[PDB]
Amino acid sequence: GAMAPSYRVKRMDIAKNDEECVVNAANPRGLPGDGVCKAVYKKWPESFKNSATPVGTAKTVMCGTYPVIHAVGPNFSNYTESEGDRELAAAYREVAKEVTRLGVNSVAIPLLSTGVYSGGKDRLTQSLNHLFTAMDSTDADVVIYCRDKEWEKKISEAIQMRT
Ligand SMILES: COc1ccc([C@@H](Cc2nnn[nH]2)NC(=O)c2ncnc3[nH]ccc23)cc1
Ligand SMILES: [Cl-]
């Protein structure tokens, strides 16, 4: 694990991360998709071999020796708020189990169920809180990747508030 486990946020493409493994915001069918998923597909295409997995789960596939954790968050256009909240929290708990199993000292993670899976709602706080609930008991350094300037500021403030 990391010597002093921390949370950090960076506004840049997760495909250029400087961590020991990456979490993909995957679709259940293991398709190239769009957004984070498409950037992960272009960078680590080999990691999409048998990567299909249900909503609320995570499946790791190696690209060489680099682990890609395919985490499937719910699409809030299909799920109710209550059921979608439960599956989002579960996808993050499965990410924590995988990061621990892998023995990595760091992980790059995006905010699950935001963007096209958000059902047109702002889910920054909801997704980030479920991320913290799952990752707080792990000792990996966590680096959150985002693309929006206002989101970078809000994530940074949320990290600092707890320290
Ligand atoms: C439906 O799943 C999604 C998950 C995350 C996302 C969004 C959430 C977001 N939007 N503003 N800051 N954050 N993030 C990215 O699109 C993103 N983040 C990191 N690296 C990237 N490389 C290429 C894209 C990309 C959308 C959709
Ligand atoms: Cl970039």
Swiss-Prot record:
Subcellular location field: Host cytoplasmic vesicle membrane
Amino-acid positions noted as binding ADP-D-ribose in the UniProt annotation, renumbered to this chain: D13, N27, G35, G115, V116, Y117
PTM: Phosphorylated by host on serines and threonines.
Domain Macro: 4-163
Taxonomy, superkingdom: Viruses
Outcome of substituting V36 to E/F: Almost complete loss of mono-ADP-ribosylhydrolase activity
Annotated effect of mutating N27 to R/Y: Almost complete loss of mono-ADP-ribosylhydrolase activity
Effect on the protein upon substituting D13A: Partial loss of ADP-ribose 1'' phosphate phosphatase activity
Membrane association type: Peripheral membrane protein
Function: Seems to be essential for minus-strand RNAs and subgenomic 26S mRNAs synthesis. Displays mono-ADP-ribosylhydrolase activity. ADP-ribosylation is a post-translational modification that controls various processes of the host cell and the virus probably needs to revert it for optimal viral replication. Binds proteins of G3BP family and sequesters them into the viral RNA replication complexes thereby inhibiting the formation of host stress granules on viral mRNAs.
Free-text domain note: In the N-terminus, the macro domain displays a mono-ADP-ribosylhydrolase activity. The central part called, the alphavirus unique domain (AUD) has a zinc-binding function. The C-terminus region, also called hypervariable domain (HVD), is mainly disordered and binds several host proteins. This intrinsically disordered domain contains 2 SH3 domain-binding sites and 2 FGDF motifs necessary and sufficient for the formation of nsP3/G3BP complexes.
Subunit-level organization: Interacts with mRNA-capping enzyme nsP1. Interacts (via C-terminus) with host G3BP1; this interaction inhibits the formation of host stress granules on viral mRNAs and the nsp3-G3BP1 complexes bind viral RNAs and probably orchestrate the assembly of viral replication complexes. Interacts (via C-terminus) with host G3BP2; this interaction inhibits the formation of host stress granules on viral mRNAs and the nsp3-G3BP2 complexes bind viral RNAs and probably orchestrate the assembly of viral replication complexes. Interacts (via C-terminus) with host NAP1L1.
Name of the molecule in the record: Non-structural protein 3
Organism listed in the record: Chikungunya virus (strain S27-African prototype) (CHIKV)
Source species taxonomy: Viruses, Riboviria, Orthornavirae, Kitrinoviricota, Alsuviricetes
